Curated annotation (Swiss-Prot), chain A:
It comes from Saccharomyces cerevisiae (strain ATCC 204508 / S288c). Residues 7-237 are annotated as: RNase H homology domain. Present with 468 molecules/cell in log phase SD medium. This is Pre-mRNA-splicing factor 8. The gene is PRP8. It is found in: Nucleus. The lineage of its organism: Eukaryota, Fungi, Dikarya, Ascomycota, Saccharomycotina. It comes from the Eukaryota. Functions as a scaffold that mediates the ordered assembly of spliceosomal proteins and snRNAs. Required for association of BRR2 with the spliceosomal U5 snRNP, and the subsequent assembly of the U4/U6-U5 tri-snRNP complex. Functions as a scaffold that positions spliceosomal U2, U5 and U6 snRNAs at splice sites on pre-mRNA substrates, so that splicing can occur. Interacts with both the 5' and the 3' splice site, as well as the branch region. Has a role in branch site-3' splice site selection. Associates with the branch site-3' splice 3'-exon region. Also has a role in cell cycle. The chain holds residues 1836 to 2069 of 2413 of the full protein.
Curated annotation (Swiss-Prot), chain B:
The keyword Aminoacyl-tRNA synthetase does not apply. InterPro entries: AAR2, AAR2_C, AAR2_C_sf, Aar2_N, AAR2_N_sf. The gene is AAR2. Present with 7330 molecules/cell in log phase SD medium. This is A1 cistron-splicing factor AAR2. It comes from Saccharomyces cerevisiae (strain ATCC 204508 / S288c) (Baker's yeast). The lineage of its organism: Eukaryota, Fungi, Dikarya, Ascomycota, Saccharomycotina.
Length: 237, 300
């Protein structure tokens, strides 16, 4: 059933599972027309499919051409997501296919379930966690490959960089969700925290800066501050 | 006009004959029901005064044999039986009629309710849903589960309704996932009508039989089946126009017959609101929507 605080360490066991987030699949700018009506213009999107144990990210880029001539795009986006996840699973060797897929929004359950009817042994689950994966497009290198794509494309990342050499996947996921929660609450301050020090760089093959263990504790502390702050600034406390 | 005699009435029981019901007292001189209209299936059904647990009954068609009821004190219920000796039967029935020991099937001349509820119901199809080949009549009770319920346990005693499942490979064509889930016309017209039921009459017959088992016996799996067969039509964008018109008439008489006190348990809020107000056919069920809105506006 639903994934929640109670069964949270299940994420880090040795049963292969994937989070699927569809919040950046169908993206638009809203604008005025010459006649003073409103219109949308789609921009490239992405499916965020993540193994929380290993950090492996299957970023399926959604090119705007997939929406040409289509109706009810918000509904289509959920089905397109489910089509792409099912294709991803079928492309993986049997021993790499997940035993569960956790969707971050309940509206993805029926689309994914129908597309996965051929895999009755893969459990499709919701979650009560409010995960911040929508902020994936605040990670500069992911935003860059999505916006530059001229055609449909799948790009593979490790969203943990090399962290697993030094920390557990529980700790790495906690760091990731803290970073993403911060970027979602105040993107500018979060990015300032991460880059302020010119001497800490991002390796070419990495997404985040090369912090020492001590600097991650400082960083992590600065992100908590940010989030608690904004939570006052927001609610005035 | 046909007759179903009773050997006796040794236990106090409420007896139903289609939508009609009457109370028989323990050892009351009751010997059956006469003037039963020919041309229709019928259902005789019982509730013991002591144990209202277990409403049970028998579907039959008097054209198919001479049937009677006899209480079994071992199995503890009123049993239907066939009498093969036609002269013993006529003689039995004539004596009971002469002594006026029978209730008359109490149909009003104006009244087409039973026809309208059983229009497409056929004994031969009932006997394929309720499998007991040695008898010409079919036993049903409150507790019997359906094949589909049994997949989610005695197969001999199940209701073999046609399995309908909207999230199934039968329902969803590879590569048409979104299309077939959002518009079930493929599943209705090709898989079920052309492939399984053959025609809409057989589909409507199972739909009507499921409702009647749901209403008279409180049979939960029957209610599930009735709502699934409604929802499959309402969720189809492409439905023959004669089918929609007939469905509206079918549902209308079911809702009108539906006693108000059983509505809370027999009507699925989600299916009805979806069917009358969201589905492709939201504007195709004028009579049903009118009676639903005037009789059960709370459900909506
Ligand atoms: C009016 O149509 C009905 C609908 C549900 C139940 C009954 C009564 N059942 C009786 C028959 C046996 C003892 C209880 C109905 O008459």
């Amino acid at each position: 059933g639903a994934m929640n605080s109670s069964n949270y360490a299940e994420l880090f066991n040795n049963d292969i599972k994937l989070f699927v987030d569809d919040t950046n699949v169908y993206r638009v700018t809203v604008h005025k027309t010459f006649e003073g009506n409103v219109a949308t213009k789609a921009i490239n999107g992405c499916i965020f499919t993540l193994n929380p144990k290993t950090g492996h990210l299957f970023l399926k880029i959604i090119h705007t051409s997939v929406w040409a001539g289509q109706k009810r795009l918000s509904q289509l986006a959920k089905w397109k997501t489910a089509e792409e996840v099912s294709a991803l699973v079928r492309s993986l060797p049997k021993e790499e296919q997940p035993k569960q897929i956790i969707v971050t929004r309940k509206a993805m359950l029926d689309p994914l379930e129908v597309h996965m009817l051929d895999f009755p042994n893969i459990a499709i689950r919701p979650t009560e966690l409010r995960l911040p994966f929508s902020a994936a497009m605040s990670i500069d290198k992911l935003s860059d490959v999505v916006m530059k794509a001229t055609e449909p494309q799948m790009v593979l990342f490790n969203i943990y960089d090399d962290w697993l050499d030094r920390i557990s996947s529980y700790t790495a996921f906690s760091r990731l969700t803290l970073l993403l929660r911060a970027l979602k609450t105040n993107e500018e301050s979060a990015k300032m925290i991460l880059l302020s020090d010119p001497t800490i760089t991002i390796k070419s093959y990495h997404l985040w800066p090369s912090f020492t263990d001590e600097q991650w504790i400082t960083i992590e502390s600065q992100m908590r501050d940010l989030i608690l702050t904004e939570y006052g600034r927001k609610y005035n406390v | 006009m046909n007759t179903v005699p009773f050997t006796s009435a040794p236990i106090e029981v409420t007896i139903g004959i289609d939508q009609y019901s009457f109370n028989v007292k323990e050892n009351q001189p009751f010997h059956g029901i006469k003037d039963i209209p020919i041309g229709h299936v019928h259902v005789i059904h019982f509730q013991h005064a002591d144990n209202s647990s277990m409403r049970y009954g028998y579907w039959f068609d008097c054209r198919m044999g001479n049937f009677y009821i006899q209480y079994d004190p071992k199995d503890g219920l009123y049993k239907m039986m066939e009498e093969r000796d036609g002269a013993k039967f006529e003689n039995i029935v004539h004596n009971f009629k002469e002594r006026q020991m029978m209730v008359s099937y109490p149909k009003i001349d104006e009244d087409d309710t039973w026809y309208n509820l059983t229009e497409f119901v056929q004994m031969d199809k009932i006997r394929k849903i309720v499998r007991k080949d040695e008898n010409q009549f079919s036993y049903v009770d409150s507790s019997m589960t359906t094949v589909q319920e049994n997949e989610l346990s005695d197969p001999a005693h199940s209701l073999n309704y046609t399995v309908i499942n909207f999230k199934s490979r039968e329902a969803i064509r590879p590569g048409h996932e979104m299309e077939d889930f959002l518009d079930k016309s493929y599943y209705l017209n090709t898989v079920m009508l052309q492939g399984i039921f053959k025609n809409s009459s057989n589909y409507f017959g199972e739909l009507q039989f499921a409702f009647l088992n749901a209403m008279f016996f409180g049979n939960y799996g029957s209610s599930l089946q009735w709502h699934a067969m409604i929802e499959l039509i309402c969720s189809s964008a492409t439905v023959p126009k004669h089918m929609l018109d007939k469905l509206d008439e079918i549902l209308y008489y079911q809702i009108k017959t539906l006693p108000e006190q059983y509505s809370d348990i027999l009507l699925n809020e989600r299916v009805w609101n979806i069917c009358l107000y969201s589905s492709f056919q939201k504007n195709s069920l004028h009579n049903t929507e009118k009676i639903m809105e005037n009789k059960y506006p709370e459900l909506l």
